[PDB]
Design a protein around this ligand. Structure first.
Ligand SMILES: *O[C@H]1[C@@H](O)[C@H](n2cnc3c(=O)[nH]c(N)nc32)O[C@@H]1COP(=O)(O)OP(=O)(O)OP(=O)(O)O
Ligand SMILES: [Cl-]
Ligand SMILES: [K+]
Ligand SMILES: [Mg+2]
Ligand SMILES: [Mg+2]
Ligand SMILES: [Mg+2]
Ligand SMILES: [Zn+2]
Length: 675
RNA sequence: GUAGUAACAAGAGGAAACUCUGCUUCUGCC
């Protein structure tokens, strides 16, 4: 049965107005949407029947919500079906929509169906429900769909579906004051054609009985007093930069580094430098290859050292050292050219000293010490605690897992780890979460942002944000993982900037709530005028952007010639194969480590530059239709060279190239083989 | 193959308000 605040939240939409339902995670927004659906079904005009679509951004959420809708509505005689990437290829989308009263989807399913001409109008629906609707920005599938809706609205020749958006946070964007915050919220509202914002106003006491906002503890801790590990690695980085400058004057290509080793700024500098180094053009093409390859190696090595410094700041020296020894093992097992041998030798000269450091107990990381004390204190107090420990990077989560496995909390608590997909598969993710829910001693989950929201996780008594910073929306989401009476959320940092960020979040969240209240005081006319003027601005920008050559592909590492754009064919808008016997000379293959079928293709092999001194990954080979071992190239593996000007360019997406490429044609293909 | 007003920014335009830009970190999706 419905809580009073749920009935309250539904009211603006029960009248047929487009509504944005902003309420805390776990407050039952999906149930509110179900109330709205029930009213919708029962009050259609004569001659009409409803057709509802519920959109979710993540597969596990799609699965969760599909089950909820089936259970609620099938018993009332409604057909409820789901489509996601798991079954998209096994079904006809048009046919599922024809046969279903309610369809639950991931939004790309609908985008693909407009793209392929299966669907021609959103007037096929009477109600569209967007879960996590704050994701409606840019080229997100939600905004691709809403752009289509708004184009229909503008043409004013069709009945639009009602729109319902669900979110726990409208956010603040880059706003610094209430005026800017109102503007940000109205922008989000404009993209979804919202007509009213629905929050709990009358039944706040009831809401507060069900939803307890976690108690925050921001703890500022110290760095190590002395940092000999960082000194040794820093010196190796200085030496590597100097070596790089003897190979080629990198300053004529990208600016000189600030030598701010062990920072994200340095990481970014390396990456920008790598981008510039691969585009180096020389008249002597052999020299271009030699220099580009050498610079590729030097920058990769600098990156790994920088990574190790960052790991050492948050975890143990032995975790940083480990990361490096695993890298150097890979280096030894690869092309392992003379430059690679030299860099490896320079590391191995210092490795004894680094090992000795990694064992000295006076070198312990105080931040990690704080973390262990926090966890000890919590489990000692309440042995039934379940904790979610958030950390930013895969490398740090992996290090923390090792720490907590080797040194169990109170000598018995065991960690599980949740990361994003490669990586971990959705089945793997669910397995870890099942164990964390039920296990007697597995009471600690260490996770990246995969755990912020969406996927079902057991409620946690303790949420620890280990150097885990972000915006207002992220802090609202992570809070919702620790939703119970008695729950705590602790942020642990050695950075005064992170403390200040969290202070700003508190202020901004207050600003957001106030902005919403001010908007809610506007009458319908005022609100609609504001949203309309934003939509017309949007349109004028979109329309202006719409009205607004042959290349060789070169190996992105060694600059060897790969193929011509003339040789490429596009399969199903996405997959770029290369035709002809000539290309076969250019690459070599190894069996694919995860040979699987998707999109009608069977993966066979990985494809590499044939140069043993290079071995750069170029893509895969696949079986498709009547053809085996077709090479599928990935654009990020190559540099493009204009045959007209000789100029080299970097493309991270196929968009700007595809226009110039031919589509796959089964007849053309069939002719390239003996009869 | 692709997305994110996410992470971290850094830089460019502007008198300023503020606009544009990332392939890195992380996650999502087909
Ligand atoms: O350029 C890509 C693309 O054409 C296709 N491909 C690979 N992964 C995906 C995917 O998740 N979704 C879609 N639609 N298409 C995909 O193969 C080409 C080659 O890419 P990779 O070399 O990355 O292929 P894979 O992941 O199999 O190899 P690796 O990443 O293990 O090295
Ligand atoms: Cl909810
Ligand atoms: K070769
Ligand atoms: Mg309407
Ligand atoms: Mg930030
Ligand atoms: Mg891949
Ligand atoms: Zn190569």
């Amino acid at each position: 049965k419905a809580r009073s605040y749920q009935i309250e939240l539904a009211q603006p939409a029960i009248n047929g107005k487009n509504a944005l339902i902003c309420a805390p995670t776990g407050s039952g927004k999906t149930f509110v949407s179900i109330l709205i659906c029930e009213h919708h079904f029962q009050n259609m005009p004569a001659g009409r029947k409803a057709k509802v679509v519920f959109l979710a951004t993540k597969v596990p959420v799609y699965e969760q919500q599909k089950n909820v809708f089936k259970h609620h509505f099938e018993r009332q005689g409604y057909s409820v079906q789901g489509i996601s990437g798991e079954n998209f290829s096994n079904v006809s989308v048009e046919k599922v929509i024809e046969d279903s009263d309610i369809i639950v989807v991931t939004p790309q399913i609908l985008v693909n169906s407009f793209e392929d001409g299966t669907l021609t109008s959103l007037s096929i629906f009477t109600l569209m429900i967007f879960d996590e609707c704050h994701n409606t920005t840019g080229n997100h599938p939600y905004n691709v769909l809403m752009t289509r809706y708004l184009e229909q609205k503008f043409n004013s020749a069709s009945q639009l579906p009602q729109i319902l958006g669900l979110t726990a946070s409208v956010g603040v964007g880059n706003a610094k004051n209430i005026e800017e915050t109102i503007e940000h919220i109205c922008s989000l509202c404009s993209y979804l054609d919202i007509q009213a914002i629905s929050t709990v106003r009358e039944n706040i006491q009831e809401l507060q009985r069900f939803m307890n906002k976690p108690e925050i503890d921001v703890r500022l801790v110290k760095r190590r007093i002395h940092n000999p590990f960082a000194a040794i690695i820093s010196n190796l980085m200085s030496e590597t930069e100097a070596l790089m400058r003897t190979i080629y004057s990198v300053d004529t290509l990208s600016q000189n580094s600030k030598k701010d080793f062990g920072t994200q700024n340095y990481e970014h500098w390396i990456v920008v430098t790598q981008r510039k180094c691969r585009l180096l053009q020389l008249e002597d093409k052999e020299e271009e290859s030699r220099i580009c390859r050498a610079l590729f190696i030097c920058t990769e090595h600098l990156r790994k050292y920088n990574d190790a410094l960052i790991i050492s700041e948050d975890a143990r020296i032995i975790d940083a050292l480990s990361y490096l020894t695993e890298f150097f093992t890979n280096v030894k097992n690869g092309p392992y050219t003379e430059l690679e041998q030299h860099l490896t030798a320079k590391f191995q000269e210092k490795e004894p000293e680094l090992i000795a450091l990694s064992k000295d107990e006076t070198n312990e990381n105080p931040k990690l010490e704080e973390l262990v004390c926090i966890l000890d204190d919590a489990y000692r107090y309440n042995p039934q605690t379940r904790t979610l420990l958030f950390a930013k990077t895969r490398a740090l989560v992996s290090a923390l897992k090792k720490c907590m496995e080797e040194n169990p909390i109170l000598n018995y608590i065991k960690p599980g780890v949740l990361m994003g997909r490669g990586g971990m598969t959705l089945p793997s993710q669910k397995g870890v979460l099942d164990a964390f829910k039920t296990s007697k001693d597995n009471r600690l989950l260490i996770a990246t942002s995969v755990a912020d929201e969406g996927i079902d996780i057991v409620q946690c008594n303790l949420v620890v944000l280990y150097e885990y910073s972000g915006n207002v929306t992220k802090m609202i989401q992570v809070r919702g993982r620790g939703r119970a009476a008695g729950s705590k959320c602790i942020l642990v940092t050695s950075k005064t900037e992170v403390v200040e960020n969290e202070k700003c979040n508190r202020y901004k969240e207050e600003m957001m709530n106030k902005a919403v209240e001010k908007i809610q005081k506007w009458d319908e006319e005022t609100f609609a005028k504001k949203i309309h003027n934003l939509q017309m601005k949007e349109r004028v920008l979109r329309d202006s952007r719409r009205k607004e050559g042959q290349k060789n592909l070169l190996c992105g590492k060694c600059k060897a010639y790969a193929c011509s754009t003339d040789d490429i064919r596009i399969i199903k808008d996405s997959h770029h194969i290369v035709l002809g016997e000539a290309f076969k000379e250019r690459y070599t293959t190894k069996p694919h480590k995860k040979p699987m079928q998707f999109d009608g293709f069977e993966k066979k092999s990985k494809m590499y530059c044939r140069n043993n001194n290079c071995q750069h990954d170029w893509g895969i080979t696949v079986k498709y239709l009547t053809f085996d071992n077709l090479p599928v190239i990935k654009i990020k593996s190559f540099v493009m060279e204009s045959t007209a000007t000789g100029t080299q360019m970097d493309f991270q997406k196929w968009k700007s190239i595809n226009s110039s490429l031919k589509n796959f044609d089964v007849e053309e293909m069939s002719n390239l083989y003996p009869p």
